[PDB]
Design a protein around this ligand. Structure first.
Ligand SMILES: [Br-]
Lengths: 15, 18
RNA sequence: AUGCUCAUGCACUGCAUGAAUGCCCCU
RNA sequence: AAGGGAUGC
């Protein structure tokens, strides 16, 4: 659904 | 580029993980 | 498009909370 | 995209 600290954090290290 | 689904064991392990 | 996934909380829907063991082996 | 394993000595 919406971004979360966890998913966001993942996206970062993941980016 | 991969995901991995948390299972009953993985989660159980983590639950016990302090 | 992790803008997920998956648990737990009196519809494969909400809400809230937590987990990168969300591993590693295998079939 | 499905299943199993803590003897995962
Ligand atoms: Br295998």
């Amino acid at each position: 659904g919406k971004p979360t600290k966890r998913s966001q954090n993942y996206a970062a290290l993941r980016k």
